């Protein structure tokens, strides 16, 4: 489908 | 019901880190989000999981605001604070519109992360377009148009075109990146 979104930032 | 515990633990870790760094806004919002996760642990199972996904999106938005405030530009930070406030405000139970606004909110979070990454990499045209689009999506979600579904679909299409332009810039292909930027700008400006 759509190009994948950038991954979520690292959990603090 | 075990996913809620993981999400709440992550949100509380975010609140701890924000208190350590001195970001009081993110700390207050993380506390509000933790309380919201607490008060929504029991209820209808089909909606609790969707609200947990919304809480995950809100925690990611808080992370984005925190890193934006720590690493310079306050535009992304303030926009992400407003987005987290909007998510927490809509979680309160207007389902028929929330099931539609949550996708737009997650797309807005993705666009905010796009803007932050592009600004950190000097690609300031993509960052400007992403900030403009995030403002558009925020004003649509907070707005009372009730014609917001079509405009949000248009904005999400523009956001995916912006993501295509971002990937083109990251790979190093400017020829397609500029065209995708033009197309996204046209799609966004067609909302007036």
Residue numbers in the entry:
A (entry chain G): 11 to 22
B (entry chain H): 6 to 197
From the paper:
Here, inspired by natural and re-engineered protein–peptide systems, we set out to design proteins made out of repeating units that bind peptides with repeating sequences, with a one-to-one correspondence between the repeat units of the protein and those of the peptide. We use geometric hashing to identify protein backbones and peptide-docking arrangements that are compatible with bidentate hydrogen bonds between the side chains of the protein and the peptide backbone. We design repeat proteins to bind to six different tripeptide-repeat sequences in polyproline II conformations. The proteins are hyperstable and bind to four to six tandem repeats of their tripeptide targets with nanomolar to picomolar affinities in vitro and in living cells.
Reasoning that proline-containing peptides would incur a lower entropic cost upon binding than non-proline-containing peptides, we decided to start our experimental characterization with designs containing at least one proline residue; in most of these designs, the peptide backbone is in or near the polyproline II portion of the Ramachandran map. For the polyproline helix, there are roughly three residues per turn, and, probably because of this, we obtained more designs that target three-residue than two-residue proline-containing repeat units. Crystal structures reveal repeating interactions between protein and peptide interactions as designed, including ladders of hydrogen bonds from protein side chains to peptide backbones. Our results show that by matching superhelical parameters between repeating-protein and repeating-peptide conformations, and incorporating specific hydrogen-bonding and hydrophobic interactions between matched protein and peptide repeats, we can now design modular proteins that bind to extended peptides with high affinity and specificity.
